Amino acid sequence: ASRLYTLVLVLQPQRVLLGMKKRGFGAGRWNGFGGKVQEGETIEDGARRELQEESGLTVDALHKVGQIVFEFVGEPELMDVHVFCTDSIQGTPVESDEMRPCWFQLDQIPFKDMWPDDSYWFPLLLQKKKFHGYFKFQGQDTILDYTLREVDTV
Numbered sequence: 001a002s003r004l005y006t007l008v009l010v011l012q013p014q015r016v017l018l019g020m021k022k023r024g025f026g027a028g029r030w031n032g033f034g035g036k037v038q039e040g041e042t043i044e045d046g047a048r049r050e051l052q053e054e055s056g057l058t059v060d061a062l063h064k065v066g067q068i069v070f071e072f073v074g075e076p077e078l079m080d081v082h083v084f085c086t087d088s089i090q091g092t093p094v095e096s097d098e099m100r101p102c103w104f105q106l107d108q109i110p111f112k113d114m115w116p117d118d119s120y121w122f123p124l125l126l127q128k129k130k131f132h133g134y135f136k137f138q139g140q141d142t143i144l145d146y147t148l149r150e151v152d153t154v
């Protein structure tokens with residue numbers, strides 16, 4: 001029992017783009033751009049769709065960099081999140097109803113105002129390593145169990 005989601009990180013040589021989530025799931029935390037994958041689109045098409053909806057950006061190419069599975073206590077469906085990276089983007093990011101975008105220097109990442117699992121795997125993304133992760137949550141703040149490894153194929 002699982003459902004597909006996407007997450008996109010725009011990572012340039014000296015900065016990374018994050019959005020402050022204004023409503024819905026994860027509101028009040030900085031994150032990459034993404035959401036549910038729809039019927040009739042590929043996983044990559046869904047990532048591009050969410051990036052455009054939430055920031056206005058389009059891209060030449062997306063690269064697969066990780067997979068993370070989330071379990072929330074008392075929720076029947078696991079979340080299967082496919083994580084993508086890009087350097088080159090097309091456009092200037094703008095605010096949407098869902099997200100307020102800002103650039104961050106790579107030594108000033110706001111981990112205290114991010115999902116707690118990001119402190120574990122985001123460092124691997126910044127180091128350009130591919131990864132598989134699993135995190136079990138009780139509510140939105142408490143990690144009960146986790147696994148994390150580097151992989152050769154995402």
Ligand SMILES: Nc1nc(SCCc2ccccc2)c2[nH]cnc2n1
Pocket residue numbers: 005006007025026031032033034035036070081115116117118
């Ligand atoms: N960084 C991060 N992201 C997510 S969900 C990302 C994808 C998403 C899904 C549904 C609505 C909008 C966005 C997380 N969940 C639990 N820990 C987490 N960490």
